[PDB]
Amino acid sequence: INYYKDAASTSSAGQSLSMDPSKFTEPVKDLMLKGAPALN
Amino acid sequence: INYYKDAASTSSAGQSLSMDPSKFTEPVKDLMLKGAPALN
Amino acid sequence: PDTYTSAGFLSCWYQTSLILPPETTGQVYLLSFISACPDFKLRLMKDTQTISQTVALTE
Amino acid sequence: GYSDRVQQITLGNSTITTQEAANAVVCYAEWPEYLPDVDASDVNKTSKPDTSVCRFYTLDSKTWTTGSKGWCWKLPDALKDMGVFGQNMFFHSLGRSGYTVHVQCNATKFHSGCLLVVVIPEHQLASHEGGNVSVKYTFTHPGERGIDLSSANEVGGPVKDVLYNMNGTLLGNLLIFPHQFINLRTNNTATIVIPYINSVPIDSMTRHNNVSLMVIPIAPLTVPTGATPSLPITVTIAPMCTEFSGIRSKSIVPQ
Amino acid sequence: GYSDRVQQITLGNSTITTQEAANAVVCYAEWPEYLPDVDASDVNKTSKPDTSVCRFYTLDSKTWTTGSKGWCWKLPDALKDMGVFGQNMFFHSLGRSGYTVHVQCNATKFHSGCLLVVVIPEHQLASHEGGNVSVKYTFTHPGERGIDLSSANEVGGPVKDVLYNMNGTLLGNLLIFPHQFINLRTNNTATIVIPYINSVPIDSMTRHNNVSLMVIPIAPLTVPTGATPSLPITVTIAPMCTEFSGIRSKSIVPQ
Amino acid sequence: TKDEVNSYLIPLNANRQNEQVFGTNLFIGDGVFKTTLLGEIVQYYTHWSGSLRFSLMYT
Amino acid sequence: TVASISSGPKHTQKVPILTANETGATMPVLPSDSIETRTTYMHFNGSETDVECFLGRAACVHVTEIQNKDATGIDNHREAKLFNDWKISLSSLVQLRKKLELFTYVRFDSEYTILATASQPDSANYSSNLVVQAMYVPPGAPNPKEWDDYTWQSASNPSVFFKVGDTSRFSVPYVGLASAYNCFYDGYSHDDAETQYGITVLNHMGSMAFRIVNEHDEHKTLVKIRVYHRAKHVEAWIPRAPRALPYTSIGRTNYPKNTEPVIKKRKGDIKSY
Amino acid sequence: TVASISSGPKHTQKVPILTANETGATMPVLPSDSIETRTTYMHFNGSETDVECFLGR
Ligand SMILES: Cc1cc(CCCCCCCOc2ccc(C3=N[C@@H](C)CO3)cc2)on1
């Protein structure tokens, strides 16, 4: 129950439960498959 | 009504109403019947 | 660092040996990295020993 | 014609027969079983030597005399040197096991005496010094010899006072732990099956013992007239469902 | 992008990667497998330590120099002291095993040299004395050290003459045995998978070795100018599908 | 003795056989690990569990 | 539910009262196996003997004390009680300890209540109003050195601010590393020849730090902190023999030497009533 | 959720542990690519490492 009118006044947000490290761990242009050779 | 998000914050648990003394009072391998001889 | 809770050691040795081509000399180096597997769990947040201060900063 | 009385336990390449048993206890009514995946944490596949480790090792014999106070063995320590069980133990980082314990003591229908055979999960001993003196490692790792409660206090060792279970509790209440009596007039062996009991799924076999087996004379031994005044007590123990994990170099432990 | 050239073998808790392989040989086109019942004789259930014995042990390294004649290891001897494999070995009456052998030797594109890596089932050695002099036990059980074909004749030892394979046959014909070459210009490792080969279903691991692994320089090592004139050769071997049976007291063997 | 680009480099010697390249314990919250991003984040939490990935790139 | 059924005379070959205790069992014998009984009902459920109930009331687990005074020229705040600190534990005081050690492993959430009262033992014009700040300093995180260190910023560490005279209350989930807390541990932290034995090595929970936020007034004020702990969501395994001798140390089983006989001696014979 | 799957011996031409870090990627290698593993579950969600939680006290 929100007792207040504005959105800033609500409690903390709830877990992204998004999670996708590939923008950080695999930003390569041509896709690399694990097990296939790195450099062909 | 829980007012809080986490489970630790809820009140005391409610009675097991489990109760089974046999693990402590009769841990024998071959079942003993009351009234039958203890050692055959 | 907890004892009971300790995780082991990591070592590295020559299996055969490094061999340089002719006209080449000296030491070669390895770079080493560390990252966590997707396996990983971290819990119970606290304050880091890695940063402290003695007076408030100002502009 | 089956009696509670006669029994055969075959485990590995070794068999025990008793013709004068008094049933058998299975701690907490649970039988040893391997470690389920749902309970697993370490990702390593474990090693299950099976029949080469799950057989019966008979420890060296003790001698019950009228002055005996009782003996105490720790597990897996007592077996730290038995065959391949022991090797596996020093060579893996983690291991887990249940046991069948068979304590033997026969006499005649003229003797009297009664031993308590009890298994205590997590038996943390007390220092006889009091205060917060610790009990050094060696002292709680007697090996197959076990601890002799009628031996003298030593320094860095535990207290050996029987009315207090080596920890500040009374002998009389040890009966809350899985146990069985050997009453010369009834019984000649005691058998207890121990499931693996711990707060972690697998642990180190050398830094932590998870049960102490204790044999304590309670009704003093009384032999017939002009009989030799003593009887030997033998303890035979078999690891069961053993699993080892995290193999490597081979632990080096104090002393 | 798979090449015959790069490979990974993971066995137990140990992994090997080679980026310059030349395929791998599987002796007689058969892969190690356990002992089927139809072939069994001993009635004992066997013990299969699995991952604690089926991992890769790297023996101590050798040094190929221009004067090297070749080295010879026997199996299971070479592993008689590796971890739990070895313990199991001394503790059971009978055992059986296949192996993955990985021989390693890297150099540069200016070196030349070529080693023959061969596995000989039942390699009965000859006495250098001639006649019917025997080859004493110790001499055919060098352990991880193996036999160094450029060492001197010793008394009670085998002959170490390379053009004769240590038995009266010519080096040139060793190619009828499963083998692979390491030619610095091509190759940097050799890998052979050995199935268990015997005339009995299971045997003693101490009185009989069932293969000798032999590494022999054939085209002499030639290093680039002002290079150090030698290369190390390393042998890593992993028991696979090992089974032990007839556990007991623990063999005591000469020397 | 003072932070330098050189403490990232593990040296290798040509022609040594059998010998040891480096050694370290695995207290990820201390010692070598401590300034790495992994080490640095682990320090915001009290407990960790999981697999680590250690890689070496040859130069 | 019947507490006793009706039962009459017996002349059988079936004797439920003869057993063999050597077996380790306690055979479930009832009044009606050996006397003639009448029906009676239980009228009772055994509600208040549930382990949740037994361990579920607040017990005092710790009393500490800190003072508000001029820190000018104090070389060791910790030592002046300018801010004490406590090594969270649940066995320093014994009423609750004997209760928990009836079990080997125990698992529960904790609810803490902290009461703080002030004392002014020497001449003050008044009673000041102080705010206490208790911080959770788990192991690995900077521990406070002065009563007003950067540590107290507590940007990542839970802290509660309440007033002296009031009470603070919050609840912490089960923070154990294993599946349960060990009430006992017959092990070491490693196979060292001289390492400590016991659980001391296992309940590495860390400590909790208290301080007054207020600067100093002209008089000095003693604030005494009492921490209460209530187990909620309790789970207990493997019952053990109750503690008979007195305790000597946090975390060891050790009892004092030349202790006194714990079993009351009869004033009379075995035959005495 | 599985934290580790069961995996056994390997003798392949497909080597997941050899990579080229020069590319800038961190290849997602797991215990089961280089040792033999057993199944285990995560039992955990990563709740307390959410940025809302990290900056939210
Ligand atoms: C502000 C503020 C302060 C705190 C404290 C957090 C609580 C941490 C304590 C965790 C529980 O500690 C223990 C210690 C020991 C035992 C225990 N020892 C054995 C006898 C049995 O149980 C159980 C819990 O949190 N926020």
Neighbours of G8 (CB within 10 A): 7
Chain H residue at shortest CA distance from F59: H22
Listed in sequence order, the residues at least 6 apart from A10 whose beta carbon sits closer than 8 Å to its beta carbon are A2, A4
Between chain A and chain F, are at least 3 CB pairs below 8 A? no
Q: Which residue has the tokens 């940025």?
A: H51
Contact D51, D242 (CB under 8 A): no
**Rounded to the nearest 5°, which phi and psi values hold at E76?**
-80, 5
Alpha-carbon span E96 to E204, nearest angstrom: 8
Alpha-carbon span H50 to E231, nearest angstrom: 53
Alpha-carbon span D165 to D171, nearest angstrom: 6
How many domains does the structure of chain G reveal? 1
Nearest to G114 by CA among G163, G52, G54: G163
Nearest to E75 by CA among E175, E213, E200: E213
Contact E90, E248 (CB under 8 A): no
Q: Burial-class residue E63 by CB neighbours within 10 Å (0-12, 13-18, 19+).
A: exposed
Which residues approach ligand 1 with their CB closer than 6 A? G 88-91, 100, 106, 110, 134, 136, 158-160, 170, 172, 175, 181, 183, 203, 205, 208
Contact G247, D37 (CB under 8 A): no
Closest ligand 1 atom to residue G168 Cα is 1
Listed in sequence order, the residues at least 6 apart from H31 whose beta carbon sits closer than 8 Å to its beta carbon are C37, C39, D43, F51, H4, H37
Domain that holds residue G171: 1-273
Which residues from chain D sit within 8 angstroms of residue G102, using beta carbons? Answer: none
Torsion sign across C-alpha atoms G227, G233, G234, G235: negative
Contact D69, D101 (CB under 8 A): no
Domains of chain B: 1-40 (4.10.80.10)
| C-alpha to C-alpha distances, B17 to G4, G48, G240, nearest whole angstrom | 21, 11, 22
Torsion of CA G258, G264, G265, G270, to 10 degrees: -140
Strands F20-25 and C9-13, by their bridges, are: antiparallel
Alpha-carbon span G225 to G65, nearest angstrom: 6
Neighbours of F44 (CB within 10 A): 18
* Resolution in Å, one decimal place: 2.9
Q: Which residue has the tokens 């450029």?
A: E150
Alpha-carbon span H45 to H24, nearest angstrom: 28
Strands G181-182 and G103-119, by their bridges, are: antiparallel
In one letter, which amino acid is H24? G
The answer to whether C11 contacts chain E (CB < 8 Å) is: no
Phi/psi-derived region of residue H55, left when phi > 0, alpha when psi is between -120 and 50, beta in every other case: alpha
Alpha-carbon span E92 to D83, nearest angstrom: 10
> What secondary structure letter does DSSP report for D50?
G
Torsion sign across C-alpha atoms E22, E23, E29, E33: positive
Residue nearest to atom 14 of ligand 1 (CA): G89
User: Chain E interface residues facing chain H, Cβ-Cβ under 8 Å?
Assistant: 2-4, 6-15, 17, 19, 24, 51, 54, 100, 193, 240
Question: Helix, strand, coil % (nearest 5) of chain D?
Answer: 15, 40, 50
Please tell me the number of Cα atoms within 13 Å of D71 on its side-chain side.
Answer: 22
- Most H-contacting residue of C30, C33, C35, C41 (CB-CB within 10 A), to test interface: C41
The CATH number assigned to the domain holding G115 equals 2.60.120.20
Best residue among G179, G201, G205 to mutate for probing ligand 1's pocket (most ligand atoms within 8 Å of CB) is G205
Nearest to C35 by CA among F41, H6, H43, H1: F41
Q: Do F17 and E60 touch (CB under 8 A)?
A: no
H/E element holding G226? strand G221-239
Q: Do C42 and H44 touch (CB under 8 A)?
A: no
Which residues from chain A sit within 8 angstroms of residue H47, using beta carbons? Answer: 15
Gap from G20 CA to chain B (nearest CA, Å): 6
Gap from H3 CA to chain C (nearest CA, Å): 5
The pair of three-digit structure tokens given for residue C21, joined into one six-digit string: 């081509």
Nearest to E108 by CA among H47, G133, F15: F15
Nearest to B8 by CA among G204, G115, G158: G158
Nearest to D184 by CA among D109, D101, D103: D109
Cis amide prior to G31 (ω within 30 degrees):
no
Strands E7-11 and D112-121, by their bridges, are: unpaired
Q: DSSP secondary structure string, G35-68?
A: S-B--EE-----GGGSHHHHH-S-EEEEEEEEEE
| Helices within G166-237 (DSSP H only) | none
Contact G232, G56 (CB under 8 A): yes
Chain H residue at shortest CA distance from D41: H40
Helix-helix angle D83-91:E83-91, to 10 degrees: 180
Question: Helix (H, G, I), strand (E, B), or coil: what is residue G205?
Answer: coil
Alpha-carbon span E77 to E79, nearest angstrom: 5
Q: Which residue has the tokens 């590939």?
A: A22
> What secondary structure letter does DSSP report for G83?
S
Please tell me the number of Cα atoms within 13 Å of E243 on its side-chain side.
Answer: 17
Angle at D76 between CA D73 and CA D79, to 5 degrees: 80
Beta bridge partners of E175: none
Deposited experimental method: X-ray
Listed in sequence order, the residues at least 6 apart from E236 whose beta carbon sits closer than 8 Å to its beta carbon are E16, E56, E57, E58, E59, E101, E102, E104
Q: What is the 3-state secondary structure (H, E, C) of chain E?
A: CCCCCCEEEEECCEEEEECCCCCCEEHHHCCCCCCCHHHCCCCCCCECCHHHCCCCEECCCEEEECCCCCEEEEECHHHCCCHHHHHHHHHEEEEEEEEEEEEECCCCCCCEEEEEEEEEECCCCCECCCCCCCCCHHHHCCHHHCEECCCCCCCCCECCCHHHCCCCCCHHHHHHCCEEEEECCCCCEEEEEECCCCCCCCECCCCCCCEEEEEEEEEEEECCCCCCCEEEEEEEEEEEEEEEEEECCCCCCCC
Domains of chain E: 1-255 (2.60.120.20)
Neighbours of C59 (CB within 10 A): 2
The answer to whether C7 contacts chain H (CB < 8 Å) is: no
Which residues from chain F sit within 8 angstroms of residue E60, using beta carbons? Answer: 18
**Rounded to the nearest 5°, which phi and psi values hold at E15?**
-130, 140
Cis amide prior to G138 (ω within 30 degrees):
no
Alpha-carbon span D200 to D244, nearest angstrom: 14
H/E element holding D114? strand D112-121
